[PDB]
Design a protein around this nucleic acid. Structure first.
Ligand SMILES: [Mg+2]
Ligand SMILES: [Mg+2]
Length: 342
DNA sequence: CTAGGGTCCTAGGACCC
DNA sequence: GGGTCCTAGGACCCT
């Protein structure tokens, strides 16, 4: 009863697309991200930039101090979406059991697959080869009996490689696996776990489930399970989008309501256009706004509302502005919609 | 020197039983 | 007192 889960993950996805479409960028350090003047961060970088230490989520000013010749690109999201659609179609030739996690990656459940003599290793290789053949982009892959191990495995032989974890290999793999490598164990959790002496899954194996539940709630059960290779989450091909957001960080903090309202007037048409792609009648469950202050505190305020409405968003932003700003500058303004349940 | 697109979990009071 | 809804905040994920 052992499943075969493949995780496919494009290499340096945004950058890889820009090097394909502009071979001049292949061998110089490049990154997709907002400029230092826009107070941007790196979305991703190519391997020439990563050699300097450039990483996703790094402030662009930090990226540029590490790599002064870094070439900064704005991003062509329709080009990324197009490659995404293509690889998802390539996935469908092998199975309908496809759970995309983002543009550039998906889980595949090939447990019941007839391709490649049922070899999940050979399927992942065919899929990566096909992606290369048809998109001239490389992908890496992980093969394992459960989702999270497959996702970890796809990083281990990046780029343009794959890694297989068999059930017999699972205990040795877990023993020294850093907790931080588990998807959903982030910096804050890893630091909490570290300060109680828990660094690896092998450390957590020596822990009592009851203690983990008291100390972390349902997250503690997840930690206990994962540390044992337990991950019963099924590949789910039926997930639906729940929200639509549009937000902008300004190059300088704003201090006047007039400036905030001007920002919203430019954000609203974009929110309407994106909502309309998925809900032509603009019917929604909730709408709301987001402010981020100069001290990086963030507040949202959102409410039940039947249909995207600009004036109510301005009104709500005005209340938030007046009521929760306390004289701080504002670096970000955002609009938000929660979609109806079906 | 700190983005923009999101999902999920938690938690208190409201409301309903 | 128990469910569920409403709401805000925050960890976390991808690039
Ligand atoms: Mg990737
Ligand atoms: Mg990915």
């Amino acid at each position: 009863g052992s499943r075969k889960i493949i995780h496919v993950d494009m290499d340096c996805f945004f950058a890889a697309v820009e090097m394909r479409d502009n071979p001049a960028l292949r061998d110089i350090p490049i990154a997709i991200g907002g400029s230092r003047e826009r107070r941007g961060v790196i979305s991703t970088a190519n391997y020439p930039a990563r050699k300097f230490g450039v990483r996703s989520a790094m402030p662009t000013g930090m990226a540029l101090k590490l790599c002064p010749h870094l070439t900064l690109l704005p991003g062509r999201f329709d080009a990324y979406k197009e490659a995404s659609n293509h690889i998802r179609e390539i996935f469908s030739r092998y199975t309908s059991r496809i759970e995309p996690l983002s543009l550039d990656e998906a889980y595949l459940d090939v447990t019941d697959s007839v391709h490649c003599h049922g070899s999940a290793t050979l399927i992942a290789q065919e899929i990566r080869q096909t992606i290369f053949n048809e998109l001239q982009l490389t992908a890496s892959a992980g093969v394992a009996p459960v989702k999270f191990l497959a996702k970890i495995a796809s990083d281990m032989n990046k780029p343009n490689g794959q890694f297989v974890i068999t059930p017999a290999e699972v205990p040795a793999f877990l023993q020294t696996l850093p907790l931080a490598k588990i998807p959903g164990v982030g910096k804050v959790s890893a630091a909490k776990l570290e300060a109680m002496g828990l660094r690896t899954c092998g450390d957590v194996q020596k822990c009592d489930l009851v203690m983990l539940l008291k100390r972390f709630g349902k997250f503690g059960r997840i930690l206990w399970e994962r540390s044992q290779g337990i991950d019963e989450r099924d590949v789910n091909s039926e997930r639906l989008r729940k929200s639509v957001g549009v937000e902008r960080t300004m190059a300088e903090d704003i201090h006047h309501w007039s400036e905030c309202e001007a920002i919203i007037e430019r954000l609203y048409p974009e929110l309407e256009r994106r909502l309309a792609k998925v809900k032509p009648d603009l019917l929604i469950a909730r709408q709301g706004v987001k402010l981020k202050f100069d001290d990086f505190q963030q507040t949202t305020q959102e409410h039940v509302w039947p249909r995207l409405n600009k004036a109510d968003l301005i009104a709500t932003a005005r209340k938030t502005w007046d009521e929760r700003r306390g004289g701080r500058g504002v670096r970000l303004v955002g609009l938000h919609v929660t979609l109806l349940d079906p």
